[PDB]
Nucleic acid binder design. Structure first.
Lengths: 161, 244, 159, 235
RNA sequence: GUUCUUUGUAAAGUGCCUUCGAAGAGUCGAGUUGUUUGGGAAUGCAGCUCUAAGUGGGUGGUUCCAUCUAAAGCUAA
RNA sequence: CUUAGUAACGGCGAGUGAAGCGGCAAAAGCUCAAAUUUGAAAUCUGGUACCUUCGGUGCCCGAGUUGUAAUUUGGAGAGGG
């Protein structure tokens, strides 16, 4: 049922191509369809309906520079707190006595330094240890600063008002 | 642990052949330049190319004046393994890691070593804002941790850390480190090995939709804004570090 | 159970050879419809205000190809195995054998489409080539004749 | 009211994109039914869909091997603007200056950040540019009342159209970025506050002060890159 | 009739000389079961079984000769 | 209209019943599939912005090389000169 295909015809390679068709001029000469398209766009440029590729750069070198450069409020008197459902996002509490140079009674006792670290975060009165510094040069870069803005950002859209 | 293809393993050797022969060639002409035996070599002086931004190639000779450079690691070229002469210079400058900067002064001894590592580094004279913003944005200090651990590299957060480690040399703060780095002084060799290297983030920094195309755009911008001379009279390519 | 002239496919070109084929072939991309258009608008801008040589790109219509094999224009032919009607190509590896034109069954009909700006292709062929890659082609050909034509002399037989 | 799940499903939008729109629109929680029901018809949602179409049609070009068409897809790309989103959020100018309290705190933090694979250099340079514009104006028309240097940073108070804004600037040292924080939430807040600040600064300058935007001296930016640079003219 | 525009090495036609020169298959055909006719050379169609050719094939007339080119399509009165 | 109630068939019986020619009415022819645009799918659907809107144009999207356009249908036809 399954004989190997004995290639009785492909065994012998062909020398000449199958047909003796004369090759056209257009296979050697530059294309006339290309010439037709080119001489169509030429007309479109004379008429002015296609702006040339050289000037298209100049149309974007002069434009799209001005972003967000217009007044949108103007004479704006209308308040958005008209429906009672706009809960204004509450400006965070003003900072009370924790400066780089504090009155050193604010500086925490050694027992409460570890007791503060023992308490779980977010159920905690201060997000920081109050510290005393003699010089302004001696003030460290506060490491837990990105954490504070990130947590405030989360408090805006995830915490119920 | 992967299989290594044949094409890669021949490509590495074929590229290191060019790099070993290139480094030896630059080594010979720089050795013959120092010994004043300039009888029959290509050129007995030093040019510096300054490419700025429409890409103007300047050709100015290197003066004897000590200058301030910020060498930036690149990753180039493609199939190359680094030879012994590259391992040495990049160990001394502590630039084994890619995307990593360091400050050095450029003199008549520094400049011959610069031609060896030029296909691996991108150099240039920075400005006061490039230095000052770089130190206040990035900075490492290798010192002791809590009680036991030594290899902690943390951050230039404080100035009292600056006091404890430097102090008596006249350096008290981070801005004083910026002073001795921008202006070539006594404490430059003290603080240069204190900020060991910088950790610059890589360009584009992703493999994906937008990031591949942006890496393609920048990768073709590389060979335009940087050339590999390969000759023994290679002009050192200086680029804008304020832009970079 | 498969008759020998079917599954003369499935015995495709190997991994290393295949990539090297495209290494060559991706060099001969046809211009994209976007690119062709801009080229001509570049011409129109120029020729409206004030020479070119014939451009080599691979050849890709089944017709065009079956024209090209049998006319000797073709040098290398790439034939994708998985095609909706298999019959649409089954003759093609034999035709080429008969006109002595070097052919290789490639794997991935879509993979041909890549090299040619189309969705699929069934068949693409590199007729004419640049001066530098002329040698690259003729060697690839030989590589193909070894690992494909000579390796599978028994592809015309066995069910 | 409606559940988060019911809001996400009703919008037929991803949770991320639901939260992105929620950040832009100023919507907060159970959500309000008429609030989500009002979010549904909005240009920003449609532009998010357009970004998704662009994403696949680019990876189509990239994944095939054609680079020119992909580069062309970048040229034929418009993006969503947060212009009309503020008119419906802060209709009056004094209301926008009541929000600028929290807006200037993100932006002055993001100036003092090393650029990572999370956050590009263009993002930080544009944020720092707005920061310098803000500092230049407040030092121009002389609107400071209170200062407070703390461990955290340095607080300022400013009568900006007579309503006393407050904002915090950290100390100019490298900041250790934790891997804990999510730099995708913060980037959208930056994206909203950034545009809000552009429109605020245009309004301030074109009302009482100067041309917007002012130029910057190149060899001044080479020296300081701070506030003695960036010269600004009145008329 | 009146005008406004016509274009590009654009589109064809004629005669001569040379170089080539592919036209439809589960169809035609054959066997049989029904249907249609007034149909004698089962005509026409259907079902079912089998199923071709290329100096071919289909149809007609006294050993040739004439005649058309199926198995695709459109179309006023 | 005629051919014609003819040829032809019909337990040659109820009977069934054409056609070609001829004369007129009216008249008109044509399109694919077939061998390569291969020096460039040259073709179209749509979306969108305008315009003089049974449509035209630009720009984008797709469809399409398993073939969409030009040329050819035996009355030949095509390649060239």
């Amino acid at each position: 049922p399954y004989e190997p295909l004995i290639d009785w015809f492909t065994r012998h390679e062909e020398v000449m191509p199958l047909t003796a068709v004369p090759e056209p001029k257009r296979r050697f000469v530059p294309s006339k369809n290309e010439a037709k398209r080119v001489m169509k766009i030429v007309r479109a440029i004379r008429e002015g309906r296609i702006i040339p590729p050289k000037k298209l750069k100049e149309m974007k070198e002069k434009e799209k520079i001005e972003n967000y450069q217009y007044d949108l409020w103007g004479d704006s008197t209308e308040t958005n707190d008209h429906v009672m459902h706009l809960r204004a996002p509450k400006l965070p509490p003003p900072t009370n006595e924790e400066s780089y140079n504090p009155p050193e009674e604010y500086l925490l006792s050694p027992e409460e330094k570890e007791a503060w670290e023992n308490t779980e975060y977010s159920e905690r009165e201060r997000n920081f240890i109050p510290q005393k510094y003699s010089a302004l040069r001696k003030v460290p870069g506060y490491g837990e600063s990105i954490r504070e803005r990130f947590e405030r950002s989360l408090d805006l859209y995830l915490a119920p008002r | 642990n992967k299989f290594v293809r044949a094409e890669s393993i021949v490509a590495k050797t074929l590229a290191t052949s060019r790099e070993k022969e290139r480094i030896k060639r630059v080594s010979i002409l720089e050795d013959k330049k120092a010994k004043n035996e300039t009888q029959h070599i290509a050129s007995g002086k030093d040019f510096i190319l300054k490419i700025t931004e429409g890409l103007i190639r300047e050709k100015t000779t290197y003066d004897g004046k000590p200058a301030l450079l910020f060498i930036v690691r690149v990753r180039g070229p493609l199939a190359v393994n680094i030879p012994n002469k590259a391992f040495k210079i990049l160990s001394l400058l502590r630039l084994v890691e890619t995307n990593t900067g360091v400050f050095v002064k450029l003199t008549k001894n520094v400049y011959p070593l610069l031609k060896v590592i030029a296909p691996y580094v991108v150099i240039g004279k920075p400005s006061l804002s490039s230095i000052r913003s770089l130190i206040q944005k990035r900075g490492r200090i290798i010192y002791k941790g809590e009680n036991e651990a030594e290899p902690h590299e943390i951050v230039l957060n404080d100035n009292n850390i600056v006091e404890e480690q430097l102090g008596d040399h006249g350096i008290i703060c981070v801005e004083d480190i910026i002073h001795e780095i921008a202006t070539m002084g006594e404490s430059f060799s003290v603080c240069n090995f204190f900020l060991q290297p910088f950790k610059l983030n890589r360009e584009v920094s992703g493999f994906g939709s937008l990031n591949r195309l942006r890496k393609i755009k920048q990768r073709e911008a590389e060979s335009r804004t940087r050339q590999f001379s390969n000759a023994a009279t290679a002009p050192v390519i200086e680029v804008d570090i304020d832009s970079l | 159970k498969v008759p020998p002239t079917i599954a003369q496919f499935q015995y495709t070109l190997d991994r290393n050879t295949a990539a090297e084929t495209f290494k060559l072939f991706n060099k001969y991309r046809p211009e994209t419809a976007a690119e062709k258009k801009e080229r001509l608008t570049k011409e129109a801008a120029a020729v409206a205000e004030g020479a070119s040589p014939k451009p080599y790109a691979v050849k890709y219509g089944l017709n065009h190809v079956v024209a090209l094999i049998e006319n000797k224009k073709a040098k290398l032919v790439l034939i994708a195995n998985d095609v909706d009607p298999i019959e649409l190509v089954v003759f093609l590896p034999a035709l080429c054998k008969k006109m002595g034109v070097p052919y290789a069954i490639v794997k991935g009909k879509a993979r041909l489409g890549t090299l040619v700006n189309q969705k699929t292709s069934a068949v693409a062929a590199l007729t004419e080539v640049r001066a530098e890659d002329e040698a690259a082609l003729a060697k690839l050909v030989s590589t193909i004749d070894a690992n494909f034509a000579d390796k599978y002399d028994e592809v015309k037989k066995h069910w | 009211f409606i559940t988060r799940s019911q809001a996400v499903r009703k919008l037929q939008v991803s949770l991320a994109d639901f939260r992105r729109l929620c950040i832009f629109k100023g919507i907060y929680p159970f959500y309000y039914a008429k609030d989500i029901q009002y979010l549904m018809h909005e240009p920003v949602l449609a532009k998010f869909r357009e970004h998704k179409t662009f994403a696949r049609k680019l990876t189509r070009a990239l994944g095939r091997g054609e680079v020119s068409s992909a580069k062309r897809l970048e040229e034929n790309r418009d993006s969503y603007t947060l212009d009309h989103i503020i008119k419906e959020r802060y209709p009056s100018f004094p209301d926008a200056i009541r929000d600028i309290d929290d807006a200037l705190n993100m932006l002055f933090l993001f100036s003092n950040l090393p650029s990572t694979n999370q956050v590009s250099s263009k993002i930080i340079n544009d944020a720092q540019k707005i920061c310098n514009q803000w500092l230049a104006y407040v030092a121009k028309e002389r609107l400071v009342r209170k200062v407070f240097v703390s461990i955290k940073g340095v607080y300022y108070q400013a009568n900006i159209k007579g309503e006393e804004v407050r904002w915090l600037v950290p100390f100019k040292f490298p900041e250790n970025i934790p891997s804990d924080v999510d730099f995708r939430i913060m980037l959208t807040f930056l994206e909203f506050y950034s545009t809000l600040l552009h429109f605020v600064l245009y309004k301030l300058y074109t009302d009482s002060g100067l041309i917007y935007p002012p130029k910057l001296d190149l060899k001044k930016d080479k020296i300081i890159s701070g506030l003695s640079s960036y010269i600004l003219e009145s008329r």
